[PDB]
């Protein structure tokens, strides 16, 4: 069932409606650039030329797959034209070739050609050595979860890194694809930034941070909810998602008011706990005292959820600047509970 389209769908993401890439450029599908023109009509005309119909900026999955496979064909020709990449590419099997193409999509041909030793190890079928060598790279440090899947593909020659996610990774994936990615990105008269502006103007208020703050504490909240000495709960912010079937569903994001002024101003914050992580913490509760195994497991899933979720948010241009992920110890050095209201107040004082 797996193939290079499904691979990049997982690693880079699939969009069936025009979106803006990291440079603001109109894009569709799996990263297929349409135009550098600022005109959405110009982008729609380039799309229509490429798909062969009036799409109005929306395409199907089969259309996106066809476009993507055209982009793979072009990447492969570039690889075969590149004296540093053709020999290793020729030597690899079809699955390992997909891994190399995956790197070329992420970092470009000249970036992949910088991995001279790793590529030689691959060409010599030294899979484990190449994998260790690749793990030491800045690529791995900046996108470790994608790099690990690609490295596993080089190491094994199988698609197995693209099968079912482990529990923490799958929790992050569902939380992003099923929730954050649907609620927050810009779209006609909706998404986080627009609805925050509507909210500010309806109540005559100002958000101190124009992002959704997501709290990933150590442990479930003391009473299972955010609490602070200096935050009061406000009316929630809403976005709307009209799915393919035409059903309008809301997303509600909690809003808090900072009860202590900061240079004369009251500030509001859209902020929530990372629900699937807190549900996991709740489920891990035992009526018996926790074992060291359970404490270790809680910490591992906490950290793995964060790294997967952080990477997804930051590598989708549409969400990168819309979320403030905060992972933190529930308690400071002196064993005192952290008050997120005071955290927010300090941050606003440093900002203003």
Residue numbers in the entry: -14 to 337
Give the text the authors published on this PDB structure:
Cyclic GMP–AMP synthase (cGAS) is a cytosolic DNA sensor that produces the second messenger cG[2′–5′]pA[3′–5′]p (2′3′-cGAMP) and controls activation of innate immunity in mammalian cells. Here we show that cGAS-like receptors (cGLRs) are innate immune sensors that are capable of recognizing divergent molecular patterns and catalysing synthesis of distinct nucleotide second messenger signals. In support of this conclusion, Hartmann, Imler, Cai and colleagues have identified cGLR2 as a second functional cGLR in Drosophila and have demonstrated in vivo that cGLR1 and cGLR2 have discrete roles in Drosophila immunity. Together, our results define cGLRs as receptors in animal cells that are capable of detecting diverse pathogen-associated molecular patterns and dictating response to the foreign environment.
Drosophila STING (dSTING) is known to function as a cyclic dinucleotide receptor in vivo, but an endogenous nucleotide second messenger has not been previously identified. We therefore developed an in vitro thermo-fluor binding assay to analyse dSTING recognition of specific CDNs. dSTING preferentially formed a thermostable complex with 3′2′-cGAMP and exhibited no detectable complex formation with 2′3′-cGAMP or other CDNs in vitro.
